[PDB]
Write a protein that binds this ligand. Structure first.
Ligand SMILES: [Cl-]
Lengths: 324, 324
């Protein structure tokens, strides 16, 4: 057990949490968990973890890491978790994650990554979660996810994405969750998202999308269960926007400029619907929404904005749908 | 495997990181790690983790926990790690940690705890680390740590401690690290610290201590290796302050009002000494400091403030020690 660090006998855990380390310590070959959080490792040179074959979890958060050389993790074939959150990584070089065959969860959030280059994830064949929230990624170029066949949860919230290349998501067609909220997408990325086939959660909050085009959800219409479009400056849903959507259960439309919903809005499977803070127009087009709201026990405070006669009245209680 | 969460088969890990849970999920009885971070559990009632005998690690950070009822963790006999950081817990009454016999690491930092009552840690007989940084603790009453015989690392930085009752530390005489920096200690707590026998790191930065009395380090003089007294408004060391100190290696005195060092200042084992920003008076008292500075490499230096003739001169270069 290294100095300044503490070790649990039975568990083969090494704890070096904020113990002032400047170098990667030497540890037993059977070490299964190595916690090096809150230290100082500005550079992770190649073979930084040489004699650690049995390592299953490696925690390197808050280590002020600025450089990750190619092959830094070269010896860690049995590694399952890798936490690199809250460092100063600006570039992820190809080869950085070499020999991480069994890696399943990779956390790179709260760094300064600006790009995902081709082949970075090539050897990460078992990667299930890729956590990249709170970086500065501006564009996902083609090949960014080549090799990551097992990837299912992809988090890219709070970056600077202004567009998604049509080929950005070709290699991860089997994503289950895709979060790209709080970016700068100025329109619904039809080309990129049309490659996803089995998305269950799509999170697009806080992107000035303005509108949703036709066939937006076709490619994953029978898998999509949760949809976030809150604070997207949403003015309109295309009449064919929801073509092919059959199992949508939770939808967030709060804080937009929506006056109407399309005739084919899928209320059949809908379970929850956040829709407050919209200038709802209480006329006949909204009859679909009324019937659904009357059916549900939660009482949202979604009032009418127009026409003038019903302004202020709740959509659920108002008598504006008597003629329709 | 609960809904919205992912489970690793071989490791018996359950990951529910920010998946929107409102209640503690049900999991397999052999589950060894349960990650429930970034959820919302305002109340942890008794027996919240009933059928989890083999649970070894439990993560509840950022869960907006405001209340921990007695017996919340009643079934977790094999628990080793417990993370409760970054919640809104204001009170920890006795019984909160019942049946946590094997608990070794307890993180309660970044909450709003105001006091440590008697018997709170009674069943935590294997507790090694107790993290209470960034709370609002004002006073440690006698009995606060009764039962915590294995406790070695105690963090209390960033609280509101204005005094330590003489009996505060009786039960934890074997502390290795004691951090109480950034509090409101208006003087060196002689009575409380005199009970510690083997302290290796004592961290008192950012406390208006004003002075250090005689025998301040007597009871643990043969173990103290690192001492932080920076930003303590320190005017002087008592002539007997360093009685019994035999292995002091690292000392921080930066940002104080020190003009002199005591004759018995222990330079024998000293390796590092931060001493910048002090009104050093370069006369006969500082010769011990001069010789030590001359001996050390790349360990910069602080300038003289008096006498007037040597204002501005570095202690390492000055010629004020020729008549020694
Ligand atoms: Cl100075």
């Amino acid at each position: 057990c290294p100095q300044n660090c503490h070790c649990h006998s039975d568990l083969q855990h090494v704890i070096c949490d904020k113990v002032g380390l400047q170098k990667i310590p030497k540890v037993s070959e059977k070490t299964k968990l190595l916690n090096l959080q809150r230290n100082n490792f500005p550079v992770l040179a190649a073979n930084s973890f040489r004699a650690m074959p049995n390592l299953v979890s490696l925690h390197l958060q808050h280590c002020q890491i600025r450089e990750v050389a190619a092959g830094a993790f070269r010896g860690l074939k049995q590694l399952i978790y890798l936490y690199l959150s809250h460092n100063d990584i600006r570039v992820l070089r190809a080869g950085a994650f070499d020999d991480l065959t069994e890696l399943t969860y990779l956390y790179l959030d709260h760094n300064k990554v600006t790009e995902l280059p081709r082949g970075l994830l090539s050897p990460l064949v078992n990667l299930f979660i890729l956590q990249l929230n709170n970086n500065k990624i501006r564009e996902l170029r083609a090949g960014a996810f080549q090799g990551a066949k097992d990837l299912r949860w992809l988090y890219l919230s709070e970056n600077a994405l202004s567009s998604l290349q049509p080929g950005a998501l070709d290699d991860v067609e089997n994503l289950a969750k895709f979060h790209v909220d709080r970016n700068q997408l100025s329109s619904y990325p039809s080309a990129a998202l049309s490659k996803l086939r089995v998305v269950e959660e799509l999170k697009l909050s806080h992107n000035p999308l303005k509108s949703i085009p036709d066939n937006a959800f076709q490619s994953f219409g029978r898998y999509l269960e949760t949809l976030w479009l809150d604070n997207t400056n949403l003015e309109k849903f295309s009449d064919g926007a929801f073509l092919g959507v059959t199992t949508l259960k939770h939808v967030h439309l709060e804080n937009n400029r929506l006056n109407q919903l399309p005739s084919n809005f899928p209320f059949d499977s809908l379970e929850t619907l956040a829709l407050t803070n919209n200038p709802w127009k209480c006329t006949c087009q909204l009859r679909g929404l009324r019937r659904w709201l009357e059916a549900k026990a939660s009482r949202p405070d979604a009032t009418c904005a127009s026409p003038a006669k019903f302004k202020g009245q709740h959509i659920r209680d108002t008598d504006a749908f008597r003629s329709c």
